[model samples]
Target: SLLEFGKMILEETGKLAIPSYSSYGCYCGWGGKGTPKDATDRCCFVHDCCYGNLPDCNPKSDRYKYKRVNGAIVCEKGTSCENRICECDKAAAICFRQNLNTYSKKYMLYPDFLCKGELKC
Candidate 1:
């Protein structure tokens, strides 16, 4: 549905498709509304995986931690999102915060699709 909708919107406005999220949910975009109160008040997209509620991003877990000159933290190497910084300065966990404000099909790729073929309308 988004592919078709994105195509229509692009055709009408002459723009490219990007990633976006409606609420604190997965790629299916089935979650409800409202955003995270903390962490800079940033909202998680439908495909957003690491925000809102009590997430399992343990700094101890290798998935959310890494070692560098500054030591270990809750983000991966290179710091591609949120301005590319090592320590989050204010909110260390905020380092992983991705202020995604567009429609990203890449972000839409969730874990559910792997086990259940694909979701259809």
Candidate 2:
């Protein structure tokens, strides 16, 4: 249901769907590692880096790893969605939805990333 909730927020906000890390990878969270980067190279969701206050995303933390295993992205054993970038994105979307509702009447339209700074993650 979180994914559906994310979609609803994204739709209402008119923000375009961002591509996954495997799709045309170009620094999703913090700038990743080396030249060509590793195949396992990945970053947090855009909203996570720009918005959510989650831990810094890196390969070291199993919660932050976005690597593919058997063709699917899987977190390390025992990790939960709370550490996932998509989860942050979903939350960011909801934050934007609420921000818009709260601020649109008083101020000019604001983007999700901007409103996200005021959110609690």
Candidate 3:
């Protein structure tokens, strides 16, 4: 399953015209009101830039968001948590089990936000 997701990421990001700066990994954690101690560590997977010819992340048209640490992209924030700084509009949405391999990847014609049977850009 994960391997399939990685393939999707590679294919999606490969279509971009510019290089992308994002990560390709995620961590697990339980939810709570107080901030999770390991949350920061979990986001350490966000990369400032992808290694190859990947494209930069675009929050508006892309379904990608990240946390900035010490001026670097440390991690990608999950919808499970509130990150207004990273996800201004998406912070309120619930996060699904994001396939790490396909986190920052893009797919043309792929709906950015999906609710029920509808599609949102």
Candidate 4:
């Protein structure tokens, strides 16, 4: 559902169907290590980084629903922590659409490297 949700957000942004990570591969659904395998994977990396900056808003904690704001999604100031989390997801969703050729379902499997128990999920 989350993947479809991302796809829907991307399509709403005028993009079509398609679609990381040293703290950067395609962690897909979990934390991972090593360089991202490709552009698709980097989307995951950027998502991780974006969440890392917020306060107590990692994958398991306060992930929430979001809608468009000003015709674009956000990571900008003045938005709530939840919105920023949404911003991260929306951008990463769009990124997946833009890099569809390199995206892979294989990357969606459990990661090779275990998450370091970090809060930045």
Best by TM-score: 4
- List, residue by residue over 9-83, the lDDT tens digit for candidate 2: 446466433322212222322333222122212222334344334445432222333334553333333345434
Model 2 per-residue lDDT at 68: 41
The parts of candidate 1 lying over 4 Å away from their true place are: 20-31, 35-121
Stretches of candidate 4 off by over 4 Å are 1-25, 58-63, 68-79, 105-121
Question: For residue 87, what is the lDDT in candidate 1?
Answer: 29
Local distance difference test, per candidate?
A: 0.31, 0.36, 0.26, 0.55
> Taking the tens digit of each residue's C-alpha lDDT, what string does model 3 give over 52-87?
113333333334344335533333654432222233
Report the C-alpha lDDT of model 4 over 1-121, residue by residue, as the tens digit.
2543444445554444332222224454454555666676667777767767875555445546554576554443433765666677777777766787765555544356533333333
> How much does candidate 4 score in TM-score?
0.57
Error of 2 at 116 (Å): 16
The predictions' CA RMSDs to the true structure, in order, are 15.5, 13.4, 15.7, 6.4
Query: lDDT of candidate 3 vs native?
Result: 0.26
Which parts of model 3 are misplaced by more than 4 Å? Answer: 1-67, 70-85, 89-107, 110-121
Worst 10 residues of 2 by lDDT: 34-43
- The lowest-lDDT stretch of 10 consecutive residues in candidate 1 is 83-92
Error of 2 at 81 (Å): 8.8
Alpha-carbon error at 9 in model 3, in Å? 12
Question: What would the per-residue lDDT of candidate 1 be over residues 24-116, giving only the tens digit for each residue?
Answer: 124223433333332322322322333232243322121222333453333344424321222222132222233333333443433433332
